[PDB]
Design a protein around this motif. Sequence first.
Motif: not given
Length: 1598
Positions: A1356-1382
């Motif tokens: 019986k699998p489970k569904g992890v609810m994750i909110e928007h701001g939680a995701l922004l935090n990551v994407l901006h986090g990886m972008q700082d360390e590993y910038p994916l520029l143009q």
Amino acid sequence: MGRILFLTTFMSKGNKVVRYLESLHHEVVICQEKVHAQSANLQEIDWIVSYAYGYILDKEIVSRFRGRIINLHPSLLPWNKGRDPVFWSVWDETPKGVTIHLIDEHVDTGDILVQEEIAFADEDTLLDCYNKANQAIEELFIREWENIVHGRIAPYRQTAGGTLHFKADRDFYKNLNMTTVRELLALKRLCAKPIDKTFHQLFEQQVEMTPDHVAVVDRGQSLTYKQLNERANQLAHHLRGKGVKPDDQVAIMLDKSLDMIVSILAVMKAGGAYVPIDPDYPGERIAYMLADSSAAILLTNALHEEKANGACDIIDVHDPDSYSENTNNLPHVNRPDDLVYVMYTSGSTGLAKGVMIEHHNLVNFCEWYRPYFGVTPADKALVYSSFSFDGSALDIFTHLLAGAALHIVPSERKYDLDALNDYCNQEGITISYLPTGAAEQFMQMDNQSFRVVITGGDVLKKIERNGTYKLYNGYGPTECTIMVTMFEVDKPYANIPIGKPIDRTRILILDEALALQPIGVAGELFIVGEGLGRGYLNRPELTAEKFIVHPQTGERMYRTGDRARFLPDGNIEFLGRLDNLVKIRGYRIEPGEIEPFLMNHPLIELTTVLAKEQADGRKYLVGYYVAPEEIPHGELREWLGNDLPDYMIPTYFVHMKAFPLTANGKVDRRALPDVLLGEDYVAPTDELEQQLAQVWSHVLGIPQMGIDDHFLERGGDSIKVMQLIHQLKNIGLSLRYDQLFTHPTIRQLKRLLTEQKLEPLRELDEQAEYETSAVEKRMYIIQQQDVESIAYNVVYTINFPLTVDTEQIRVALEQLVLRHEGLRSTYHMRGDEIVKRIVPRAELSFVRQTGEEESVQSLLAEQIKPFDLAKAPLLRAGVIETADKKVLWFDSHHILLDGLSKSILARELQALLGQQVLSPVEKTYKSFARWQNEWFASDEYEQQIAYWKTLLQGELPAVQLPTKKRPPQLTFDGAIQMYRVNPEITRKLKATAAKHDLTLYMLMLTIVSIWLSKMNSDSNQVILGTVTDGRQHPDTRELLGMFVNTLPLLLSIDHEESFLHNLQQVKAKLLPALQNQYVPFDKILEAARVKREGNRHPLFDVMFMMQGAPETELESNMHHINAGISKFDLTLEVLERENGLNIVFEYNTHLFDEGMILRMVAQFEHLLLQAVHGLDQQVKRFELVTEDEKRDLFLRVNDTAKAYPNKLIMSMLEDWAAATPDKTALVFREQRVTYRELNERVNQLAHTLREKGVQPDDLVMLMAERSVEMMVAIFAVLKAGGAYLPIDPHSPAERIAYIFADSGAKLVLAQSPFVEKASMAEVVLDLNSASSYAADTSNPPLVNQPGDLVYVMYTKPKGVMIEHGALLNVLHGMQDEYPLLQDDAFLLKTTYIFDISVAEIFGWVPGRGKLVILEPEAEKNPKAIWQAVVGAGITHINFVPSMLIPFVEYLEGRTEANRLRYILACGEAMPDELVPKVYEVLPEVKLENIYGPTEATIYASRYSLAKGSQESPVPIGKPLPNYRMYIINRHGQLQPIGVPGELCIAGASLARGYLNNPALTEEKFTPHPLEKGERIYRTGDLARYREDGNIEYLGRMD
Ligand SMILES: *P(=O)(O)OCC(C)(C)[C@@H](O)C(=O)NCCC(=O)NCCS
């Protein structure tokens, strides 16, 4: 105008002289450092002018500058040449002046050029004189320089005479240079005939002067001097006929009576010294004095005969045959240096010590006493004091030599002072000594007979008295015969002084350094002169410690331990004891530490609890308290009983309306009023309970043992329990070690022993070779397995002053060599039997070296060399002499010197260094070795080894510690860090152990066990080794040798139970081990089915050693030198030092970095402090990590706060299609969608969704495989407002129906083929069909907030609810360390039913980069994935150890990927080899290890892997921005570095929870106190931090 070299003490000295020379255009060079012939400050120099230069110039320099080298010596040369000239000119009172002279070959002896007299005023201090002379000589040089330069002066040779002094000559006077010249010379005066007769010589001399004068009176009977002398002579002839010789001891056990005085004098005349034994003493004291004293004869009655239990050859003083016919004085056989009596000190610090007093000691006192007090035959003296106290030698001996009459105090009248005063007025008692207690109480009486009442022994405070007798306050302990000072109390004093020294007695007030204290300055009262006794009986170490030879003065002095000062008039003020601490009922405690517990009482405002000693020295505590009304005595005792052991509970409590205060506001402790057996004290009832009460008092050195008193609350250690068992078998009672703790009272022990049903150590006959003990065999085995090992070298250092003669130290050690067979023992291998040989004499290596304090340890390390166990002595020594110290070092082997052996070596070295002799060693180690070898064959051993078999048969627990990679084989390179428990905490620990029938060892053991438990993931069973004394036979306490046995302790820590419960369980688990302690560790290994294998030690890796306080001062000043050795992984050696605990952490340097031990050290302290304050708290509640570790852990790992824009991920997509519409946004094979093309397609799909009721948190479902359609679906599900729930089209239908049903999703977007696979779908917008796309392309309104769900990931699998701001935090986090520029681009490799795809899918829009939609065909195909990397110039690529392995297999041979920036591995622990192999396959690229659970929004930690670094365990790294990661144990508290624990993530990126699975959500997202109440996600993943903070993945908690 020549250059001039100014050599002076410091730079500013003689600066006037320098400035003058410079005004004459002389270039001057000021130099304080030592100058040598080759010094650069010597060439081009025309004159050298020295001025108190701290060094001597090479004779080369002096001759080179002949006629041109002047010295400014501030003395009237030749007087006071050399060092400290001004001071010595004042102290030695030598002519005073200043001299400018030609330096010649010797020190301050050359021709004078200019000399000038100087004068010092009496009021000037020695500093003022020093300054005045320095100023006068400088001005003298300034006036006559011109005459010196021009050679106009005729140098003239110094007068004949003078003095000379060196640096050290002033050490004794170092504290005096701030005293006025008058004060100094006053102290000089204050510190500026022999004795021929023995006492009985003087007494006999007095008998012939007043034969018929009354000598002794006892009720109606009385004896005259003639009768007394004759009757004593009769008994003396009988005693001398019985073998009594000079210095022989004859015990006397009678009541104060005529027979008493007859027996006393009879012993002297016979030639020996009388050991007095008050028969009212308890049997414990009475048996001790008979045994300790070398007295074969016991003068006693039939009334008290049985009290000796036939221990002594009794001579009944009533048996007429005990008296000879001969009444004459015996031939004198005694010298004034022969013993006259042996008194026993108080029983405060334990068992009493026989004070040996010589005749000249007593004669000096009596010869001073008589004229000082004007004693005459008219005087009648009271024989008041117990004959055992020297206060009775005063009573008897001083008055007999004066012809006075002795009056035995009636037993009834002794303590009823009303009848005593009556008797004193009746018989006319004129002079007497009464103890301060009885004296003050007698002052109240209406006495009219006394003329001189002498008191002392306790602080006299009361002067008012109803009598015309001169009150005299005397002072002096027993060691220096009755009294060394006497004061005539002429008036009241706040501190009635103890007076001036008596005849042939000098008294020095010295500081810790034995240097003279200025008059009026308090210090330790040192007694010098004729009163100093011979020493302590059978305690030569204590004699050397207390009877010292002053280093500077050379005089023999006694160290009283009392604080005193000289008053200006010469009298001495007694200021109590030096030591702040006091021994109460067997414990050294700080009485002020009881104050908080009393003051904590509601009714108590202030409290000041002092230590008061009874007349017999028994110390008790009085608790003074300021309260409104008196508090019931029993109420306070119970109040303190709840927190304190009995001995910290004051015997008496004194209520007071307020405390007397000093001028400074402090409680005037002296002004506090004065005040037995104790409550719940049950005196012995049966004859058995009395016997049990006697052995107890003896073992514990404390009297009056109640039958409900607990053994471990009366000072009982484990060593003392052994003494009880030994001394009980002597009494006929067989007690077991564990039986003592289960029956820790005499009431319980009486019932235990209802049988009353011997066995000394048999010294072996001489053999060529002897059996070795089991532990001797082990030590030998260890050494022969590494002959070059100094691991078992026992190295110690003693810092001696330069005054010590190194040859004396050398000679003392050589005696210790010739005294202990162990130091002449050589171990050899005769076949398979480890065998010892005893050498009759061995030559001790004693090296002498000169160095500097900076090089002592370096010179010593070279001396610590391996021992040849076949060569004696197994001991080396040497002296490294520095400018300040003579450092004695000695190195022995552990096969000879264990901790107790060392105490015996320090003990006896101190005696020898202090010019004492040692009793010959009665037993030998080899005799114990055989006894124990035969005992191994007894039933007792079979029962003891049976306990170890049954205990160690099953699976044993292992204790894993936060260590470094173990060496393949056991290493012993080590280092030490020492944690200092301060004395205060140490007493708290001892008080806790005593309160709950525990030893300090059990307490520290349980703290170490919990410590090890907490560092071992809070294990229930801990195993650690310990060391027992291994002195199985009681006849081995005094032997140098390796006795200590190693024991494995299987202790069970119940973290759910309190610390005390844990203490009782550890006690319960320890006592069986200690009961069966005498199975050799090697045989415990056999019984345990365990053998010495591998890089770990057999049963345990952590040793816990514990040795009590040093027995002697020398042992205290012995600094155990660790030569970089660690016998185990870690050894905690708690050492009682200076009333604290020196917890030495001896650790393996290959297993722990200095920082790793500094932390474990800090953790143990934090834990020890939590146990001492959390007696009733559950052990689970004790923290291991310190607050400083948490702060640094945050600073080094979780200081991730970086503000990020809250603008949503699709809002970020919108801006880029509006600012740069036409740029490349997506790349799927031939498709190269732009930002404007993508955004509009997304806007179409978004409207569709909103038209079908998609509010925020609404769950839309996706099952569209890698295609642009997926991006359109996601980016627009996000725009619509609902969350996207990915599903795999290839999953069974039972799960898609399960996921859909459990998810409650409202609608489903699926790629065209997968609509039928989405069976029974509520509202199914076919992703690919255009119908699902509204023509409207306007960016819909962003009603979604940062708190609404962005996507729902299923596990019986489970569904992890994750909110928007939680995701922004990551994407901006990886972008700082590993910038994916143009320029950059992202590849899509991970299936989007995994939290890694979320990074690919959105990690491009931040930098306006592109997203390569790798085709499902090329999913696991690394070569196809390799094309994308080169094809589209991928810059960011997410990977996994499983896929990155084959991707690596296409090695450097494949090139053409310049644009590739990062490889981000995640999902699994990365192998070590996978890092460098990549680098050779792809340089100029940054590899990163990533960890992140689906519940922590995609990512959580990252570790950048440098090209030039290789990691052993590739760590999952430190957390991302706004991420916080915690490693907790099964009880929910933060783990320290290295300790495994459950990894937990916190911060803004935590998933909302599991979808409609709240019991599961609240199970895994628990509000933790570590996140300020906010919840943490418990991952189920075991991990541990690194030194730098990077987390290391250890695996799921299985
Ligand atoms: P108890 O609980 O007061 O103490 C038990 C004990 C094992 C410490 C004690 O019985 C003992 O044998 N102490 C000797 C410690 C020792 O010999 N250290 C030598 C280090 S070389």
